[PDB]
Write a protein that binds this ligand. Sequence first.
Ligand SMILES: COc1ccc(/C=C2\Oc3cc(OCC(=O)O)ccc3C2=O)cc1OC
Length: 331
Amino acid sequence: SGPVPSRARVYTDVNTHRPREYWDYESHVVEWGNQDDYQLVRKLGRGKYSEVFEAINITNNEKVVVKILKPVKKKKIKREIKILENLRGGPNIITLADIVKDPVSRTPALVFEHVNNTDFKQLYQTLTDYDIRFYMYEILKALDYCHSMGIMHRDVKPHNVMIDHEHRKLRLIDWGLAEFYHPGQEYNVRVASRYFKGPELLVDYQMYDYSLDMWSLGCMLASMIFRKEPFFHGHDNYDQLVRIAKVLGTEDLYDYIDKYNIELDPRFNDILGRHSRKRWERFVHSENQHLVSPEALDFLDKLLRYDHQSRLTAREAMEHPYFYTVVKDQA
Ligand SMILES: COc1ccc(/C=C2\Oc3cc(OCC(=O)O)ccc3C2=O)cc1OC
């Protein structure tokens, strides 16, 4: 009894009709920049594969960000950077300003736009129903962009969404987990933050597509409109599924497991329990009411769907009344 195969409902063969050079990042030959152009000012964060610095461009005195890369894997390095390059110029997509060959490592460093990030600590008490809509929309553009460009981001979460609230500047960052979609292809499930994991990952189902990202985003929206960070708060990957099944409910879950002949580790049976589908009304109170609206609950209700093929696409989400008001464009 095997798992039923899946295709992207949209943008399936985007890489399929692109020249090999576009998606074969292995054969990509990088052209490095001048590491002496840049001086590191402060450390701004560190993961467990990299270290992020505030930096300076000494030819012009501009602020940048410098991602130095602990000696990981040539394959992994060139992916992020082929992708970063494939998407440069797109909406709200962080600009890769430079690439540099680095001493610190026997590996290198990437140089990005500075985004003077309003901290999500005094952002979360200034933001308005309109603000979130605006920002949801801008991130959607980024996610439609890169999806249309044959690419899943795989690590959507509020830290990878820098926002300079003062200029209304949103860029989407951290494409180190990002990967090309090829239909038919089984992928790593160990991507994305726990809280932002799609059910297809939590259920070890690998033939996922872009709509993973719509899940993550979808949790984000939940978060912001409900003033709860993270919305789904589990203590490991098992717990997380429980924390989802307590609002989405066990029925539709087990039907999702049913459609894709996905077979679940037996231990999951006893923790998973039996839960009903809660109304999205149930999480509206007095502190978060002013951000919650029928358009929203409904918008949201179309992203958090077990069945990956069910989730709204980026295109459709941007075409949702929730976003109508959003200041509609031109010269
Ligand atoms: C609230 O504290 C801050 C935290 C982060 C920033 C700015 C930035 O942090 C980044 C991390 C980045 O990671 C690059 C990557 O991991 O892909 C890229 C750009 C920025 C970036 O512009 C600015 C901040 O204000 C001092």
